[PDB]
Amino acid sequence: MTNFLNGVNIGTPGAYAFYQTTQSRPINVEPFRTCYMVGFASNGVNKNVPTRISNLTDFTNVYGTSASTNSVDLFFKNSQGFGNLYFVNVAIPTRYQIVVTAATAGSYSVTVNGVTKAITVVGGATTTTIAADVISAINNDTVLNKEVLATVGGTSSTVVITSKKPTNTTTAAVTGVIFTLTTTTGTSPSVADYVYTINNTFDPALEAGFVIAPEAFSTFTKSDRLSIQVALENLCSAYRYQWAALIDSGAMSEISNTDRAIAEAATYNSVQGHCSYYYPYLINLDDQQVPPSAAVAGMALYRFVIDGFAEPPAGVNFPLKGVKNVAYKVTWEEQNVANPEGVNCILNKENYGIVVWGARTLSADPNIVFISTRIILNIVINTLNRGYDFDIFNSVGGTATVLDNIQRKTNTLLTTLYQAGLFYGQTTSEAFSVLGDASVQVPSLLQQGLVNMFIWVVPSTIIERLIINIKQTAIGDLEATVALDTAALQSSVEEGTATEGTAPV
Amino acid sequence: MTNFLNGVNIGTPGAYAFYQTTQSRPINVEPFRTCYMVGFASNGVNKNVPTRISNLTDFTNVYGTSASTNSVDLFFKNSQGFGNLYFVNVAIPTRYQIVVTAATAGSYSVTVNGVTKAITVVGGATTTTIAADVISAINNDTVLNKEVLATVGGTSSTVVITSKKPTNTTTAAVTGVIFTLTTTTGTSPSVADYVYTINNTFDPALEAGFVIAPEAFSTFTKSDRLSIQVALENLCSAYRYQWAALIDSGAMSEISNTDRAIAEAATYNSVQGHCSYYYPYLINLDDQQVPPSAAVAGMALYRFVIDGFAEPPAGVNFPLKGVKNVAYKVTWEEQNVANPEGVNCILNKENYGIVVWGARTLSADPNIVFISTRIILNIVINTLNRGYDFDIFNSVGGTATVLDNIQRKTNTLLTTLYQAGLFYGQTTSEAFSVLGDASVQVPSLLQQGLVNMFIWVVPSTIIERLIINIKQTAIGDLEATVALDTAALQSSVEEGTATEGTAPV
Amino acid sequence: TNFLNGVNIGTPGAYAFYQTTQSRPINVEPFRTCYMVGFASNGVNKNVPTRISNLTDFTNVYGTSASTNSVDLFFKNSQGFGNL
Amino acid sequence: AVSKRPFSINSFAVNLNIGNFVDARYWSKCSKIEKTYNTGEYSDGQSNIIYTLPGAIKYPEVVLSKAFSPGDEELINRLIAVNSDPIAWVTVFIQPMYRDGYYNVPQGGKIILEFCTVARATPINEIDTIGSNAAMFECALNPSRIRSDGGNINWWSEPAA
Fold this sequence. Notes:
The PDB classes it as viral protein. By secondary structure, chain A is an alpha/beta fold. Chain A has 15 helices and 22 strands. The two termini of chain D are 36 Å apart.
């Protein structure tokens, strides 16, 4: 990029001086430093096609107007140039309305997606019969029935063709006076369109990372938000992806309190904790409400770059930027009730700023409670996938060295991760174990092309709450009491009765 | 060859420098590192003659303008000189138009390829009768009836003689005032011409290799494409060839999506899996759409030379060259549905380039699912044929020693392939077996000159999909869980219950 | 389980599942089995010795019976190293 | 699965360059070729395990031997004079090859021990009027580098960049 090409278009052999501009620092291509924002823009320039965005100016230039502009601005503010953002514009299915004016006898044609269908009209026919014939032909064609859907319009003499693949462009044409063609298309997206985009637009070859639909969550109603959350859960937990989703509460005008937020989170379900709920909307510098997902994702990527991937997106040393307040002040009691329900709160802590004060998922399984564990597992899975993509399509010869080599590749791949520090153990023998040799390979599965690998990992944990127990000794009773108390505490912790008993209120 | 003959034309003794020019790596005669492209050029320089092509410049010079130029360029770009290309130019049969301008009485002659048929014209005769008599004579002549075919022209007084052997030149002449002769020849080849070239031009002696017809598959309609695929199947599956064919889809405008591709590949049939269907067209550096078969064949030969012949033409390693994008983006669900049916997709994998992500054939047989298996079988067959070519026409005395010699030769020939790594087995006893001695020869077949010999082989296999099964272990209890699970898994595998059960959907 | 996760998949990709209890097989040796004679209202296997994979399988096949606690204790104390 | 037989101990041909002289005489015996790393022991403080820190690469001495025959006087003179010139160096050329007799099929480039200095020249290993062994001219060299060149295998390449 810049700062190196200044002298290329110089002919004379002298020495010259230029001024250092901002240098674009390359973002690494490691699994989990990407965010995918699903949004809408009237100019569907890249619809159902993830496109990388370099800055808010680029976003505005490409997609013009969109309710996701504030979210993109927050994401870039909080990421500070780290991590990548990919925008996915939702495609509105095309629609074509065909009106059958009269039942004139003759030969006509209806062409859909370049496939032409003849229509012979005999005397005594009706426009309703002609519409029925058109619908039957389109819905019976083996290709058109898959590509589009033909239905009855507002009248018996009207046919509606709806594109069933919004990603691809649908073309229509007619030959015949009695047919009247109109190009209709909703000017706004629907929850069904969002669901299709989520479920059919992402490629496992893409970089893993966070997925956010702040526009959809802010605009849609309860059931539509539930549908979007279900789609995101299925996507992230799909065996292909193993990604993470950051769910935002609905508009605060509806979800005006932490109890409503808790009800929404309770309705939301994520067995493996792939979805994480964040509630307080952020009031940006222009006094505009924004869902917190974009800011959370940007801060998460910055945290991954700075303090490593084992750290969750929370804490007082990574306050959000581009905001000046929250849209609702979460009380300590409300948080004490909500955090165990998986509702991660955002607090306008004084002397620190706006800080995320929760790192929990929406899972009931105690082993995946924190989002850090989910992110660690996702990183492991994606690293292994991108490693093994090199070994896919390799010959399993008579040596069968392949399977053994693949098991040894895992060993080294997971060691690289252990050195990164994603596991709980002083040594790799405490951190992870692998099993992928020929001893666990079935000849029939090998003939089919299937190879099985088994991995065990121990993710690291975090510090959620810290207890301080204090005692006031007498004048000159230091270590005349300390030692006594200590011995008892150490003995209880070693024997195993420290935890056993009842938990104080 | 260049870099060695620089000094041949010098007389004065001395040391002379000539700037090391481009080099050539002699492509060895292995029975598969060749590709045969069937195309068309306006100037039939080598009508129905497989002619080797040194490079794109040589192709352009010999054949001039042709729709196969892009395919040839991509083939060479992706082959990097490790593999030969043989172009076969489709000959258009010559047609001769005869018109009986009048029914004037007199004896006249019509000469076709040196055979003169004489027709007597008498009073009361008509041009219709004259043409009918000429047609009858030509079609009943024992030589002309198989050399050419005569048909009625645009009028009852018009006749058209079409060559039945395009390779052999057809010469026509007439002696008679009523007879007027003109030379018709379609400037564009027909599906019948392509079929004849496929089914009557190739040679078993020609080194085994891939067969492609990108121009035909891109410029023909559905029925013609199906007919050409049938001809390719017959050629590659014929007992004298045993080759492999690569099929491209129709032009993207017709085959606009993977559903249409599945449909096309379903209409296509290949019992023994000699044919491999590919779909996404490659956009070359000039933004021209090109069938992928040429690039796929080039990459296949390159990968055969680098990683050996047991590997399939796919994988992130060995990505395609001379291209910058695909004509259509295949979704993961589309591929998940199409790959089982035999559609090998091509994907613009970011961070890897354009990669073929499929190695299946069109066969329904589970044994020959993979093009790698098909290629291994073809290589074995063709190597054995080349080896036995020397033993052909040898005598057979009472010693019957030639039979033992053939068996020993087969053993060494298969040992060479086993060293190459084409079989699944740690030893030859696990890889292959032979039976060709006198114990299976029959005196009647020996008198007829027929010798039978039987081969058993175990072709290698590939890694088509890798499964990662991971468990999230709690802190500290990693080793016990690993021991328990590993014991269970190994016990199940060794007992044979690892596969029995109900497969998850 | 753990081996058939990929049979019903078409795409050639690397992708992950989560490990499950892979019951370990019991070899055919004398004294690896317990035969429990009980009664169930549903005579599904009247006087027919039938193997039991686990307590849920027993409950599904035979429904309510007074031997449920015995079955549960047997499986708890056998830990999969035995047939019932 | 023995695709190709390994190199035997007799499967190498050894030649020398001595300064500007291209000596045309083959050596029948040579010692081991290596790249040794001198080591260092350290710890960071979290464990009582000792680790090894490679350093100070060294290419140990190479001892060549051959039958002491006529025409060896010029080789002796070149060897004993080369060290006199600070610019002169000794280069050793080892071509691996498969030979059944005088016939050989070389494969790959040749290992080149570059910038070697003479540490010992022993034209006569011993004298014994009753002995029957062949006199062995020995020569000890101290290589400073190793590379490969003149073939399509490149046995010894370096981590240059």
